Amino acid sequence: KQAAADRRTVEKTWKLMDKVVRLCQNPKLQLKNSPPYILDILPDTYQHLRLILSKYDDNQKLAQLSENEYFKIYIDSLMKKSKRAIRLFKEGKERMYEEQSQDRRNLTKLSLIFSHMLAEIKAIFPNGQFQGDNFRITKADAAEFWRKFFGDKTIVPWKVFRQCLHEVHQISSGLEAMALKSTIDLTCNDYISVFEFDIFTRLFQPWGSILRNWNFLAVTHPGYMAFLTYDEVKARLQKYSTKPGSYIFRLSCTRLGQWAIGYVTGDGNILQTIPHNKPLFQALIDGSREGFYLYPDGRSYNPDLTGLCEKVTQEQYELYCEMGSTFQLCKICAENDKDVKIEPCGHLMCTSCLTAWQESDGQGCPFCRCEIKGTEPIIVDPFD
Ligand SMILES: [C][C]1[C][C][C]N([C]C2=[C]N3=C([N]N(C4=[C][C]=[C]C([C@]5([C])[C][C][N]C(=O)[C]5)=[C]4)C3=O)C(C(F)(F)F)=[C]2)[C]1
Ligand code: NA
Ligand SMILES: [Zn+2]
Ligand SMILES: [Zn+2]
Numbered sequence: 001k002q003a004a005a006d007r008r009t010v011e012k013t014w015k016l017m018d019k020v021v022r023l024c025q026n027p028k029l030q031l032k033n034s035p036p037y038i039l040d041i042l043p044d045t046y047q048h049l050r051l052i053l054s055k056y057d058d059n060q061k062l063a064q065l066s067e068n069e070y071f072k073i074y075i076d077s078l079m080k081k082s083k084r085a086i087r088l089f090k091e092g093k094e095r096m097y098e099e100q101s102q103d104r105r106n107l108t109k110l111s112l113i114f115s116h117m118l119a120e121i122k123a124i125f126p127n128g129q130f131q132g133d134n135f136r137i138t139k140a141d142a143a144e145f146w147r148k149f150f151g152d153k154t155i156v157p158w159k160v161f162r163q164c165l166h167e168v169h170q171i172s173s174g175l176e177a178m179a180l181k182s183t184i185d186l187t188c189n190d191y192i193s194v195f196e197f198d199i200f201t202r203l204f205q206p207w208g209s210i211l212r213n214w215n216f217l218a219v220t221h222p223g224y225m226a227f228l229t230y231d232e233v234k235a236r237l238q239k240y241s242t243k244p245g246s247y248i249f250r251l252s253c254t255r256l257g258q259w260a261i262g263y264v265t266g267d268g269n270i271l272q273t274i275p276h277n278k279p280l281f282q283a284l285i286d287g288s289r290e291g292f293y294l295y296p297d298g299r300s301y302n303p304d305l306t307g308l309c310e311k312v313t314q315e316q317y318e319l320y321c322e323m324g325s326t327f328q329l330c331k332i333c334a335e336n337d338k339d340v341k342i343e344p345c346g347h348l349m350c351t352s353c354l355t356a357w358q359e360s361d362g363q364g365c366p367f368c369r370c371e372i373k374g375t376e377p378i379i380v381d382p383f384d
Contacts, residue, residue: 002072002073002075002076003072003076004066004067004072005065005066005068005071005072005074005075005076006062006066007053007062009075009079010049010053010075012079013049013075013078013079013082014046014049016079016082016083016086017042017045017046017078017082019082019086020038020042020082020085020086021038021039021042021043023085023086023089024038024039024042024107025039026096026097028097029096029097030099032229032231034229034231035115035229035253035254036108036111036112036114036115036253037111038107038110038111038114041111041114041115041118042114044118045078045114045117045118045121048118048121048122048125048128049121051127051128052065052121052125052128052129053128054128055127055128055129065130068130069154069155070124070130070132070154070155070193071125071130073155073189073191074117074120074121074124077117077187077189078117081110081113081114081117081188084110084381084383085107085110088103088106088107088110088383091103092104092106106383109323109325109383112186112227112253113186113187113188113325115253116186116187116196116253116256117187119195119256120186120187120193120195120196123135123195124154124193124194124195132154132155132193132194133152133154135154135194135195135198137194137197137198137201138198138201138202138257138277139201139202139205139206139207141206141207141208142197142198142201142205142207142210145168145207146194146197149164149167150164153194154193154194155191155192155193155194156191156192157190157191157192158181158184158185158190158191158192158335159190159335159336161184161192161197162177162180162181162334162335163335165180169210169211170211171211173314173317174331174332174333174334175314175317175318175321175331175334176215176312176317177334177335178317178321178324178326178329178331178334179219179317179320179321179324180211180214180334181324181326181329181334182320182321182323182324182325182326183200183214183218184196184197184199184200186199186256188324188325188382190337198257199256199257200214202257202258202277203251203257203258203259203280204217204218204280205277205278205279206279209308212308213279213280213281213308215312216281216303216305216307216308217249217280217281217305218320219312219316219317219320220312220316221296221303222296222297222299222301222303223247223248223249223284223293223296223297224248224249224250225248225249225250225297226250226251226323227250227251227252227253228248228250228251228252230260230262230272232250233248233250233260233262233270233272234262234270236248236262236297237262237263237264237270237298238270239298240264240295240298241264241268241269241270242268243264243295243298244264244265244266244268245263245264245291245292245293245294245295246263246264246294246295246296246297246298247261247262247263247264247287247292247293247294247295247296248261248262248263248296248297249261249262249280249284250262255274258274258275259274259275259280259283260272260273260274261273261274261275261283261284261287261293263287263292263293279308281305281308281309282309284305285305285306285309288302324382325382325383326382327380327381327382327383327384328380328381328382328384330348330349330350330353331349332349332350332353332357332366333350333352333353336350336352336353337350337380338350338378338380339351339377339378339379339380340354340375340376340377340378341375341376341377341378342354342365342370342372342375343372343373343374343375343376344370344373345365345367345368345370345372347365347366347367347368348378348380349366349367351377353366354366354375
């Protein structure tokens with residue numbers, strides 16, 4: 001349920017973004033200029049919102065823009081994320097100037113979110129004009145899935161997207177579905193846009209085996225490094241400079257939907273290659289046979305990926321989820337947010353799942369099996 005994105009509403013987001021910029025200009029933070037750089041992203045977001053308002057210049061156009069489903073979600077998401085950043089600095093206090101602190105980590109998570117939100121608004125409203133109903137999903141087979149389940153929709157709730165995906169590619173557990181939500185829902189707004197879908201389907205192509213490619217290359221592959229700057233890629237591989245063929249692959253916030261493979265050359269240098277619009281596992285296979293990519297993260301064992309041409313533990317999914325904003329999500333269903341607290345154990349889940357559990361004669365807490373002495377309605381945030 002979102003309010004209409006009228007001029008007054010869009011303007012509140014700017015004022016909130018202004019506080020986040022003022023907060024992030026403190027020199028005791030020492031933010032590296034490396035992207036995502038919040039001090040550039042927030043003004044660039046204001047500028048695009050301005051460029052959009054310049055196209056919907058009269059009351060007739062503003063009314064059309066206000067009721068745009070994706071735009072209403074965008075403004076509310078931008079506003080909520082902006083308020084979260086202000087709140088993060090308030091509660092964090094001096095922990096915002098300790099680089100290794102969880103409050104700082106949470107700010108890094110938001111910077112990635114604001115960065116993905118900018119690339120999204122720029123792809124959905126290129127030159128300030130709506131083109132979501134004209135967005136071209138890069139892989140035809142992936143596009144055909146979106147068209148079948150979601151028609152011309154630019155964005156659909158994660159709850160809806162997940163059940164439709166399961167119909168084509170089975171999701172085997174709640175934790176696997178939670179890892180999937182953090183991978184695809186990059187803007188952390190509980191919706192999947194056609195842009196986020198295009199990102200995911202380009203990275204883990206081909207569509208035919210998409211979840212096998214994701215489960216292997218991102219959840220369990222030792223060379224997978226999630227988003228990194230080139231500075232972080234070189235610092236990781238630096239310890240293996242004396243081992244030619246050592247490699248890692250990372251996502252890049254300035255090249256969404258593409259992989260960057262960093263590797264050690266025969267002469268000790270750390271270089272990188274951006275693969276074409278082809279499966280990342282094929283570039284790793286060709287690279288291994290040619291002698292360029294042999295040691296993932298400097299490790300001697302290179303997983304045989306040829307199985308992807310012709311099982312993930314719950315713990316592996318849990319570790320993969322750490323960078324995500326899914327703590328507020330019920331782990332049982334991975335589709336409703338946690339809205340109830342068990343007492344005295346304290347485990348949280350959604351009321352729908354607790355009800356399904358009690359109705360199945362499940363003994364005690366679904367998680368720890370301890371007696372439910374009582375329950376309490378609660379609201380959870382990803383950074384709790
Ligand atoms: C660009 C660069 C800058 C500086 C920093 N670095 C490092 C990092 C990385 N990162 C992070 N986060 N992240 C993420 C988030 C969300 C989501 C995600 C996915 C997609 C899913 C889950 N998982 C995986 O792997 C992937 C991710 C990532 O990447 C961080 C923090 F802090 F925020 F946590 C850090 C980066
Ligand atoms: Na999203
Ligand atoms: Zn649930
Ligand atoms: Zn419990």
